[model samples]
Target: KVFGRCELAAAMKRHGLDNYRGYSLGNWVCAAKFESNFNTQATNRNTDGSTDYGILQINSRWWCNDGRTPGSRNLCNIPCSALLSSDITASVNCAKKIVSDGNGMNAWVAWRNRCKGTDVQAWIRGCRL
Candidate 1:
């Protein structure tokens, strides 16, 4: 798990995701803060029987396979378990692809419910990123 916002920001910057596709660092960091609190292993089961995986909470219903849902789209071509790693590269890459597919940060519920249209700079407050 990441210790604080600074760590997460550093990691995101290292991955070139600080401002990807016109979305700011605050957009990604705020969503991660609410979705998984930067916990790489975070997972939540949805009411529809799909699960949200990792810090970005990529949904199993369309993004990846968790073995709980058969016939999953698995558009990311990844196992949901891959998202639950501390490395986080796989999960971030999947998130990037999801955003590029025209979803933007809307793919994450946390972004829709909490980060959208909000001043999310606090998510990066005191971070050197």
Candidate 2:
């Protein structure tokens, strides 16, 4: 879950993730399924207006406190050092903070709902909040 889908899943497989299926450990795979579509490049802007970008949908301008371009100092915020770099996941995690203090998946649901009935790429605004 901390890493992107492919990298994390591959790492999990190496450490035997299948063995934990249908158990507490399953949440990792579950959250992966929800946050990203197994797309490391997954990112969501927004139908509204925002400048955030990347797989975790990291608010490059806000959280990173630099320009919104890829090479900006804010780019250093990329999780695991450019490992899980998509802004959507980062934004989902960002949203999670306001949704319920890291308790519920409501933020995840909001993101999923935002993507519903629309192309995933449609959400790629750099900042929405």
Candidate 3:
């Protein structure tokens, strides 16, 4: 329930996420829409027994520790619940680190499936960024 595209864009830009890691804000917005609908509390269980956390849907298999869960790389060194907060700064920073690690947005299945190759201008339509 964080945004309806426009505000999210403004917020992301404010957080220095406008063109992070060579990906456009539009791509990030589109990915966030499909990933968690901008809900910071969002979580999803994957078939591989891993869980995705936060608006970017970062996978616990390689990013954050969910406490009881094992086998996570925990690269971010933060709890999975940390990404569930309404303050998106931590999530955005972790997402930036994730994208910077050579995976790009390809790390997100939502981006690959939905945002990839799409006309992304509509994602930022009317947003004054």
Candidate 4:
């Protein structure tokens, strides 16, 4: 499922990402924008052969099991397939775990390139907090 900008914002907030690890809701929304355009089924392959899955684009290498990654820790203990669904539960949970793993939000390069050190309030402008 594809989410509208503010819609995605609301979803992330509901998933406990608002101010998560000192990153605001807009930051997460911004990451979703650059990562997968808010489409839950999005997937991208890395040069290392691991795939990023879902709107949050959790990687199969360390976060989820995809059965194809040469090395996978499956730290999220979930099938990467779950990340492709519209339900943000698994995706958000995995993202939270990524942050908890000491990487913080820097786990997503899109966040580093676009959201980090930028004013992301625009991403949440019209959304209710």
Better of 1 and 4 by TM-score: 4
Order of candidate numbers by TM-score, starting with the best: 4, 3, 1, 2
User: Which residues of candidate 4, in runs, are more than 4 Å off?
Assistant: none
**Clash totals for all models, in order?**
0, 27, 0, 0
Q: Highest lDDT among the candidates is held by which one?
A: 4
On TM-score, the leading prediction is 4
> What's model 2's overall lDDT?
0.40
Candidate 3 segments whose C-alpha is farther than 4 A from its true place: none
Cα lDDT tens digits, model 3, 7-124, are: 8888888898877977888998999999999888899998888899888998888889987567668999888999998788888889988999887889888899999999976899
Candidate 2 per-residue lDDT, tens place, 13-98, comes to 44433334222223333444455555545455544433343333444433444333454344344432242453334443443343
Model 2, stretches more than 4 Å misplaced?
Answer: 1-7, 10-23, 51-66, 69-100, 110-129
Reference-based lDDT, residue 26, model 2: 35
Q: What ranking emerges by lDDT with the best candidate at the front?
A: 4, 3, 1, 2
Candidate 3, clashing residue pairs? Answer: none
lDDT of 1 by residue, 15-121 (tens): 88877999888888898889998898888988888999898888998989888886779999999999998887898889889999877888777799999999887
